[PDB]
C-alpha cells in the first residue's frame, strides 16, 4: 500500500565524531616550520545554519596530538650540536662580591676548573660564573645534574620565540568550530561552522599565568571539568590583557672555550658595572580591576554571599611553585606572591614588583634524565607581555567554613593547549544513505 | 545580466539544507573523499582513506548500483521503519535528522538489498538460459 | 580518473560516445582530416583551451539524463 521503495544516495552530508592525525599549515627556530606546509592566504569558512553540535573541551584528542608534536619538535631541535660530556669536573668556587646589592648576595659563584682541549693530551685552566641553583657543594662544588645525566647544550643559532601553527584535517574529515559566545567548553553549541584549518596558535610555555594568548569577546570566563570537585583545575580567561614588563639588567659577557674538535662551550666572562636582581612589574589598578571581575564571576558559581580569598602557592618544585617562563632566551622563575594575596567580602601609577631568579640547567617537560644548558645572553634584556588568563585551584573546600580560598597552579602543559583548542572538534563523513522514493528497478 | 556575481558551494555547504535540496550536491562531497615517523603516519592515513573508498565502492557494487550516485532499487519501503510521508521528509527534514531517526533500521535494509540483488541476478541468469 | 569517468556515466568503458553535440567553435575540421590525417598529440594541442567547458557540458548532460530516467521510472 505504501508503494515507496528504498533508494541509495552516495555523498550525503552526514558526519560523526572521529579521531585522526591533522597536518601542518604555517606561514632557525625550535618549532621547525620547514616540515610544515605553507598556509593559504585566504582561508574559507562555511557557516552551517540549523546545525546544533555537541562540544566538550575535556575529551579533545587534538590536545594530545599537539603535546606530542611539540615534544617531538623540541627533541629533534637539540640533536645536531654539542653535548657537554666533559663539563662534569670538580669546581673550585668563591663568592662574587664586586658591586652587588643586599638581595643578590650568594646568588653567583666564581668557579675555576680544568678542561680538555682540541688535543687529547693537553689541558687548559678556565673559569666561569655560575648561579647558586646550578652548583651543589661536594670550597669544592659540582654541577647539579652530574649524578643523573649529561646535559646537551642549547644550540646558539636557533631561537626559542614561539611561532603560530595551524592544524588541518585530511581528506574525508572536517573540522567544526563553535562560534557561540559564553560557551563554557562543554554542552550544546547552536552556532557551528566548518573550517579547513584552525587559527594560528602560539605554543607559549609558562606556568601560573597564560601569556600572549586569546581574550574573551564578552567577559571573563571560568571553566572547569567539575567545579564542585576541588581536585580539578579552574581555567580563567580574561576579556582584556594586563601588561607585564620583565627584565634582567645585568650586562653579561660571553666567551668561547674550545673543548674539542669543532666543539665550543660558552661561558660567562664577567659582569660590566653593578649587579642587580632581575624583576617584573605589573600595574596595580589593572590587576585590582581584573581580580574584581574574577571574583564577581566566581560568586556566580560559589554563592553570592561568600568570602573569596586569594593566597600563596602551597609548595613543591621551583617550576610549579613559581611563575616560570622564558624571556630573551633566559629562563626566569618569578615569585608571584604580591598578586594572589587578598580577601574579598560580599557587599595612581605605582606597580607591583615581582623578584625573579635566572636558571640555566633546564628540564622543560616533566621528565627525569634529560636536561639542557642555556648559554648566556650578552647584555641587558627586557620584554613586555600580555596576561590573558589564569590557572587556579581551590584549597580544601569543606562545608565547615563558608570561605573559599584559591591558589595559583600549573605544571601540566596540556592545559595551556586546552585554552586555545576549546572551540574546535573533528568529525568524519558518512556519504552513504538510504531514503524512500517511487522508482522500481 | 550585469550586477550579480557568482560563487561556488563549498564542502558540506548543504548540511543545513533540506534533503531534497541537499541531494543535488552529492558530487562536492564525493570528490572530497578521494582528495620519518610523520611520513609513516601520513602514508597510513592515505592508505586507510583509499581502503575505505574501495570498500564503499565494493559495497555499492554488491547491490548492483555500481558507478552511480543515485540508484533507486526494487526493495519496498516498510511502514515500520518510518510512517512519515514524502512531503514531511524531502521538504521539512535534513539528512542528519533522517540518519538519526532510522539509525537502528539500516542493517536489515542492507540485507534486503543484497538478497533482492541476488534474486534479480538469478532471475536474469535463468532468463538468459533460454 | 576512474571517478571522473564514472561521473560522466562512462564507467567501466574505454570508448564511450555520448549525447553532447560537437560545437563548430571548438574545431571546424571535418572527420576525414581528423581521424586520418592527424595524431592524438596534435589534436590535444589544438583543442587544449576548450576542455573544461566540454567536461562541464558532459557533467550537466549526465545529470539531466539521470533526472529524466528517474522521472520516467516514477510511472
Amino acid at each position, epitope marked *: 500500500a505504501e508503494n515507496l521503495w528504498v533508494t541509495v544516495y552516495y555523498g550525503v552530508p552526514v558526519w560523526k565524531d572521529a579521531e585522526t592525525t591533522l597536518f601542518c599549515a604555517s606561514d632557525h627556530n625550535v618549532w621547525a616550520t620547514h616540515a610544515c606546509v605553507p598556509t593559504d592566504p585566504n582561508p574559507q569558512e562555511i557557516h552551517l545554519e540549523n546545525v546544533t553540535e555537541e562540544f566538550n573541551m575535556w575529551k579533545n584528542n587534538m590536545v594530545e596530538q599537539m603535546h606530542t608534536d611539540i615534544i617531538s619538535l623540541w627533541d629533534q631541535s637539540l640533536k645536531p650540536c654539542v653535548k657537554l660530556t666533559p663539563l662534569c669536573v670538580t669546581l673550585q668556587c668563591t663568592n662574587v662580591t664586586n658591586n652587588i646589592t643586599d638581595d643578590m648576595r650568594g646568588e653567583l659563584k666564581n668557579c675555576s676548573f680544568n678542561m680538555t682541549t682540541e688535543l687529547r693530551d693537553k689541558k687548559q685552566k678556565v673559569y666561569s660564573l655560575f648561579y647558586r641553583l646550578d652548583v651543589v657543594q661536594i670550597k669544592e662544588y659540582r654541577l647539579i645534574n652530574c649524578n643523573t645525566s649529561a646535559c646537551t647544550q642549547a644550540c646558539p643559532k636557533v631561537s626559542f620565540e614561539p611561532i603560530p601553527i595551524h592544524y588541518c584535517a585530511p581528506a574525508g574529515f572536517a573540522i567544526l568550530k563553535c562560534k557561540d559566545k559564553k560557551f563554557n567548553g562543554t554542552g550544546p553549541c547552536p552556532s557551528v561552522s566548518t573550517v579547513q584549518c584552525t587559527h594560528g596558535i602560539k605554543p607559549v610555555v609558562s606556568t601560573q599565568l597564560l601569556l600572549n594568548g586569546s581574550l574573551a569577546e564578552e567577559e571573563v570566563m571560568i571553566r572547569s571539568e567539575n567545579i564542585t570537585n576541588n581536585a580539578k583545575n579552574i581555567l580563567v580567561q580574561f576579556n582584556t590583557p594586563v601588561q607585564i614588563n620583565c627584565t634582567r639588567p645585568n650586562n653579561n659577557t660571553r666567551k668561547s672555550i674550545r673543548i674539542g674538535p669543532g666543539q665550543a662551550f660558552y661561558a660567562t666572562g664577567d659582569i660590566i658595572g653593578d649587579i642587580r636582581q632581575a624583576h617584573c612589574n605589573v600595574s596595580k589598578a589593572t590587576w585590582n580591576e581584573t581580580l574584581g571581575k574574577v571574583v564577581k564571576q566566581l560568586r556566580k558559581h560559589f554563592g553570592n554571599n561568600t568570602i573569596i580569598r586569594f593566597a600563596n602557592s602551597s609548595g613543591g618544585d621551583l617550576e610549579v611553585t613559581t611563575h616560570s617562563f622564558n624571556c630573551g632566551g633566559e629562563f626566569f622563575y618569578c615569585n608571584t606572591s604580591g598578586l594572589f594575596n587578598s580577601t574579598w567580602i560580599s557587599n595612581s601609577n605605582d606597580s607591583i614588583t615581582l623578584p625573579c631568579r635566572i636558571k640555566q640547567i633546564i628540564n622543560m617537560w616533566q621528565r627525569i634524565g634529560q636536561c639542557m644548558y642555556a648559554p648566556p645572553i650578552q647584555g641587558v634584556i627586557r620584554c613586555v607581555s600580555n596576561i590573558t588568563g589564569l590557572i587556579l585551584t581551590r584549597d580544601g573546600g569543606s562545608t565547615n567554613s563558608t570561605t573559599e580560598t584559591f591558589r595559583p597552579g600549573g605544571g601540566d602543559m596540556r592545559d595551556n593547549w586546552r585554552s586555545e583548542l576549546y572551540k574546535y572538534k573533528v568529525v568524519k563523513i558518512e556519504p552513504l544513505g538510504v531514503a524512500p522514493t517511487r522508482c522500481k528497478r | 545580466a*550585469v*550586477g*550579480i556575481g*557568482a*560563487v*561556488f558551494l563549498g564542502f558540506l555547504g548543504a548540511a543545513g539544507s533540506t534533503m531534497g535540496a541537499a541531494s543535488m550536491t552529492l558530487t562536492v562531497q564525493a570528490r572530497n573523499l578521494l582528495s620519518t615517523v610523520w611520513g609513516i603516519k601520513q602514508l597510513q592515513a592515505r592508505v586507510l582513506a583509499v581502503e575505505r573508498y574501495l570498500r564503499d565502492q565494493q559495497l555499492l557494487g554488491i547491490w548492483g548500483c555500481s558507478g552511480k550516485l543515485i540508484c533507486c532499487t526494487n526493495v519496498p519501503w516498510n511502514s515500520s521503519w518510518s510512517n512519515r510521508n514524502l512531503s514531511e521528509i524531502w521538504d521539512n527534514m535534513t539528512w542528519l535528522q533522517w540518519d538519526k531517526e532510522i539509525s537502528n533500521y539500516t542493517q536489515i535494509i542492507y540485507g534486503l538489498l543484497e538478497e533482492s540483488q541476488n534474486q534479480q541476478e538469478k532471475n536474469e541468469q535463468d532468463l538468459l538460459a533460454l | 580518473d576512474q571517478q571522473l569517468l564514472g561521473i560522466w556515466g562512462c564507467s567501466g568503458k574505454l570508448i564511450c560516445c555520448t549525447n553532447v553535440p560537437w560545437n563548430s567553435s571548438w574545431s571546424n575540421r571535418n572527420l576525414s582530416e581528423i581521424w586520418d590525417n592527424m595524431t592524438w598529440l596534435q589534436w590535444d594541442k589544438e583543442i587544449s583551451n576548450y576542455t573544461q567547458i566540454i567536461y562541464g557540458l558532459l557533467e550537466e548532460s549526465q545529470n539531466q539524463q539521470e533526472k529524466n530516467e528517474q522521472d520516467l521510472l516514477a510511472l
Partner: antibody
Amino acid sequence: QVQLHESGPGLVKPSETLSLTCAVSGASISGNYYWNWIRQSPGRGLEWIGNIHGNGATTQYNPSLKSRVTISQDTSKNQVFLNLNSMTAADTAIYYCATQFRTYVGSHLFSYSDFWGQGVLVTVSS
Amino acid sequence: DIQMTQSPSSLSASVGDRVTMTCRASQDITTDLNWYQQKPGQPPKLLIYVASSLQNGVPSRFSGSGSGTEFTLTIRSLQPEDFATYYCLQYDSYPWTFGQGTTVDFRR
C-alpha cells in the same frame, strides 16, 4: 547570516563631503560579489548611486552623479566606503548598502543571495 | 538610462483579492528584472528574481511573468502582510533604475 551595517555623519553642511561606511559581517568581500549604494528620499524614492566589484575593483556610477561620487573598499577591514562631495539640500535621504551574488555547483544554480542594510539617515542643512 | 514605469500608481484591495501590477521598460532587457516588497519603516525585501522565479521562503501566492519590455506581478490571494510598496528593478544595463513603485492599501 550575512549582515550589512551603515555608519556615517547625521548632518553634512552644503558643499561639504559625506563619507559613509558599510561594514559586512558573516561573509568576505575578496570573492565575486556586487556591492551597490542606494538612496531613498520622499521626493525621488529609491535611487541607484553606483556599485563596485569586490574581486576586480571595477566601479560603475550613475551618470547624473558620476562627477560627484566615489566608491572604494577595504577587504582587510571588511568595509565599503562611499564619498559624495558638493552636498546639497536635495541629497537628504536614507542611504542603504546592498550586496548581490548567486551560488553554483558546477553549471547548476543552487541559490540566489541578496542582502540589504538597515539604512542610515543623512540630512543636509547649514 | 533605461526608464522604468510601474502601473497602477496605487490600488486598494481586500484580503484574499487578486492583484495585478505591470512594469514597462523603455528598452528591451530580456528577463533581467526583480520585484521587491518594502513595508513602511523597513528595507526592501526580494519577492521575485529573474521576473519568474520565487525567492526561497516567499509565499507561493506571489507570482511573476513577462519578458522584453512588459512584466507583471500577480498576487493571487492578498493577505494582511501583503499591503506594502512593490518596486520593480532592472539590471540588464547600467545604470540601475527603480520604478516609482505601486502602493497597495487595505480596503475596509
